Swiss-Prot record, chain A:
Name of the gene encoding the protein in the UniProt record: Nfkb2
Coiled-coil residue windows: none
Highest rank taxon of the organism: Eukaryota
Name this polypeptide is given: Nuclear factor NF-kappa-B p52 subunit
First and last residues shown, out of full length: 226 to 328 of 899
UniProtKB/Swiss-Prot annotation, chain B:
Gene transcribed to yield this protein: Nfkb2
The name this protein goes by in its record: Nuclear factor NF-kappa-B p52 subunit
Species annotation: Mus musculus
Amino acid sequence: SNLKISRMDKTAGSVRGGDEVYLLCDKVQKDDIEVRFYEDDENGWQAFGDFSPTDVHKQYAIVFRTPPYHKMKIERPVTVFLQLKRKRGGDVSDSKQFTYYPL
Amino acid sequence: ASNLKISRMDKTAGSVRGGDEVYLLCDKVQKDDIEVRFYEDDENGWQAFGDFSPTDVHKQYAIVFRTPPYHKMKIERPVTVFLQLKRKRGGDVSDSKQFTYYPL
């Protein structure tokens, strides 16, 4: 609960990932942050937000590319959770929702 | 703050009717002392401003805003313009970026 996501560019996208999202957050260290996309279920899937250090703006924003879903053949939009977290870190932000769309 | 700077930004095109949300990452800015001015070199140097309350001025380094309707609603093709960050007091600006309005 140390980390926080204030606002996001988008909350949906192509299951193929590759979508650029602007993320407004509370202070974050550019060398110890990641954007984890995950599902809360026995399978426990997780993909990560793509981006280098330079995309973290003044420690208060992150411009990244979405990861793709593990199944491209989905019939309807699937919602998943996405949060902020320190690498190995055990510190995270509350988790917002992100939906993936078909093709 | 030194000199205004638009680091990067969301959209760079939208509808001539304005109303589109643009994320814009910039250098240090102060909530009640900054503006996002749209305009044209033109004789009639049209001018408009992005809409946003002071709450949309996230941590001094970013601005979430909606665009303003262009002055010609019925344009034949896509019309491009410059939109620079501007200071409400000093009056100084940031290098101007380009934004393109689209027809209905």
